[PDB]
Design a protein around this motif. Structure first.
Motif, mmCIF file in Angstrom:
data_model
loop_
_atom_site.group_PDB
_atom_site.id
_atom_site.type_symbol
_atom_site.label_atom_id
_atom_site.label_comp_id
_atom_site.label_asym_id
_atom_site.label_seq_id
_atom_site.Cartn_x
_atom_site.Cartn_y
_atom_site.Cartn_z
ATOM 1 N N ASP A 9 51.154 112.929 17.757
ATOM 2 C CA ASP A 9 52.387 113.587 17.298
ATOM 3 C C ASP A 9 53.564 112.667 17.369
ATOM 4 O O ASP A 9 53.725 111.902 18.335
ATOM 5 C CB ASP A 9 52.687 114.834 18.095
ATOM 6 C CG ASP A 9 53.701 115.701 17.415
ATOM 7 O OD1 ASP A 9 53.704 115.802 16.146
ATOM 8 O OD2 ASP A 9 54.541 116.309 18.131
ATOM 9 N N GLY A 10 54.368 112.703 16.314
ATOM 10 C CA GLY A 10 55.675 112.043 16.304
ATOM 11 C C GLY A 10 56.814 112.945 16.745
ATOM 12 O O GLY A 10 56.759 114.181 16.592
ATOM 13 N N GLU A 49 55.393 110.150 12.994
ATOM 14 C CA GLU A 49 54.065 110.778 12.905
ATOM 15 C C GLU A 49 53.012 109.726 12.588
ATOM 16 O O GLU A 49 51.960 109.680 13.232
ATOM 17 C CB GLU A 49 54.065 111.858 11.827
ATOM 18 C CG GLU A 49 54.928 113.091 12.131
ATOM 19 C CD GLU A 49 54.283 114.127 13.059
ATOM 20 O OE1 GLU A 49 53.285 113.794 13.745
ATOM 21 O OE2 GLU A 49 54.783 115.295 13.088
ATOM 22 N N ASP A 73 49.542 117.491 13.247
ATOM 23 C CA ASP A 73 50.217 118.625 12.618
ATOM 24 C C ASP A 73 51.171 118.140 11.529
ATOM 25 O O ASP A 73 52.006 118.924 11.045
ATOM 26 C CB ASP A 73 50.968 119.459 13.672
ATOM 27 C CG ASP A 73 51.872 118.616 14.538
ATOM 28 O OD1 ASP A 73 52.508 117.708 13.971
ATOM 29 O OD2 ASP A 73 52.065 118.937 15.734
HETATM 30 MN MN LIG Z 1 54.360 116.847 14.464
#
Ligand SMILES: [Mn+2]
Ligand SMILES: [Mn+2]
Length: 133
Positions: A9-10, A49, A73
């Motif tokens: 995740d970023g 991301e 995501d």
């Molecule tokens: Mn994300």
């Protein structure tokens, strides 16, 4: 050797602004073999991301896994990585070439979208690092 589930995740606070990454390597019996969160300087959301993807791939390759299931995501990363989407952006083009170079090291790979609440741990690693920037 072995399968890993690699979450990434970023996080970013501007366009660009202070940014960070988070990533989690899980085995199949569900152990967190390694995880990480780091600040990355100034970057966009979409850059962060990608950078989290690349950090996850590098960690998994370091640990010598041969079968990786990426979980994230970010639609934009998924669609570009799988070739559904392309981009003109030379920087994100370069990040894809880097991700694909890393992927070539695994015998098999996949990527799956999870809701952010399912990605809570990578998200926490990125954001806790960013909150400390
Ligand atoms: Mn994300
Ligand atoms: Mn997040």
């Amino acid at each position: 050797g072995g399968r890993v589930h690699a979450y990434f995740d970023g996080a970013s606070r501007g366009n660009p602004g202070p940014a960070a990454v988070g990533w989690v390597l899980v085995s199949g019996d569900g152990g967190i073999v390694a995880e990480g969160g780091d600040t990355i300087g100034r970057a966009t959301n979409n850059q962060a991301e990608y950078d989290a993807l690349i950090a996850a791939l590098e960690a998994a390759a370091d640990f010598g896994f041969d079968d990786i299931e990426l979980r994230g995501d970010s639609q934009l990363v998924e669609k570009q990585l799988t070739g559904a989407w392309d981009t003109n952006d030379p920087d994100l083009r370069r990040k894809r070439v880097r991700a694909r170079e890393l992927l070539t090291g695994f015998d098999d790979w996949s990527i799956t979208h999870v809701p952010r609440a399912t990605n809570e741990r990578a998200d926490a690693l990125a954001n806790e690092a960013l909150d400390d920037a």
